[PDB]
């Protein structure tokens, strides 16, 4: 809790892959989830000759998640669901960020092929709900 703001030292940032993770200083067990890790033995990352900093990370650390992923999806964008075997195209038509209890938008349309990729705020409580839904469309590229 407040152990990671004490040895958070900074950012481990590669722009050409959107990686984004917090750095700490020191190795620990409570880290490898949170971040990018400076390993004892190695440089302090200050910079200058004779420097050669080595910072770790676990390599199922979470680069990218599914909200902040899915709310970079945009109209006209499109999306598939294979299901055992057929693959399902669909093209986003509706974004609506509603309540957690504002289930209502979401319902047999007739005469429609709609899908929705829902998720939630990664919190439980007052959690806003993302709806990104699509119209079926044609499997393309």
Do not use: W
């Not at 900074?10 to 490898?32: E, H, M, Q, S």
């Not at 399902?88 to 504002?102: G, L, N």
């Not at 439980?124 to 079926?136: A, D, E, F, Y």
């Amino acid at each position: 809790q407040a152990y990671v703001k004490r040895h958070l030292i900074g950012r481990v940032v590669i722009p050409k892959l959107a990686v984004d993770l917090p750095l700490f200083d020191t190795t620990n067990n409570t880290l490898l989830d949170q971040g990018a890790v400076v390993l004892p033995g190695t440089s302090y990352p200050r910079g200058g000759k004779n420097t050669h900093t080595v910072v770790s990370a676990h390599g199922g650390l979470p680069t990218k998640r599914f909200f902040t992923d899915l709310s970079k999806l945009k109209r006209g964008q499109k999306f598939f669901l294979q299901v055992n075997g057929k693959k399902m195209a669909y093209q986003v038509f509706r974004i609506k960020t509603v309540r957690p209890d504002e289930t209502q938008s979401l319902r047999i349309e007739p005469g429609r092929d709609l899908a929705t990729l829902m998720t939630c705020t990664p919190y439980m409580i007052n959690s806003h709900r993302l709806l990104v839904t699509g119209k079926r469309v044609p499997y393309t590229e």
